[PDB]
Amino acid sequence: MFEARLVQGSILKKVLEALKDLINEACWDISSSGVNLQSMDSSHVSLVQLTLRSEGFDTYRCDRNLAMGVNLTSMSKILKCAGNEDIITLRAEDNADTLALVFEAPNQEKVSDYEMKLMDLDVEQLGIPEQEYSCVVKMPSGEFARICRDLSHIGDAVVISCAKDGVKFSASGELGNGNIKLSQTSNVDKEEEAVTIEMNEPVQLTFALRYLNFFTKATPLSSTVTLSMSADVPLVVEYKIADMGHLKYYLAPKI
């Protein structure tokens, strides 16, 4: 049997807002260590990897391992019926065609309970090895979102160039071309407004702005985002789910 209780239910809500538009059906791996998801979008261009550690849940319980086939649009609809400060409890039996969700309101005068039908979904998992990246950029998440949506006005693809002094995004289209240059920051007010660069060797790649603009729907999950880059390998856009885990996007480069 599986029962997880999260006081910060808003997290779950946000997680689904970041996934429902990119992947439609996904398999949630439930285990003793927590909740994990790994799915490719329908076009096989990007990979999404969600990790929610069991120690981030207020109460956690998992007898046997589970592979819950979830339609993410339906689960998103159900999570839209929950307040941002609601305590959310997931509960599913060992077989169970359904996943139970419980929304507890702060008041304690309101209690919602929903039951979602599951799918028979193949746990079909990719094998992502842990690596070292030539260039890693830590920057504000809203800034990254603003950059991608702005350059979408200019072209289809963004060229991310990564050097020891900062990161540069470039776009080109029939109306012209543009360059955004973010430099390292010698301290701001707080940490989250800083731009820091960890470089071993310079990198420069090209990515589709459409998928990045899909990725930036995870912005309400973290104030900062990091981009990990290495020659000839996919980009990793990572959003930290504070104290709980992380949401990772992998985007294959262009030609």
């Binding site: 096989h44 261009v45 990719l126 992502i128 693809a157 390998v233 294959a252 030609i255």
Partner: peptide, 11 residues
């Protein structure tokens, strides 16, 4: 510039 898949790297 074409688009490479993810199935070529990670599989």
């Amino acid at each position: 510039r074409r688009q490479a898949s993810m199935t070529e790297f990670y599989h």
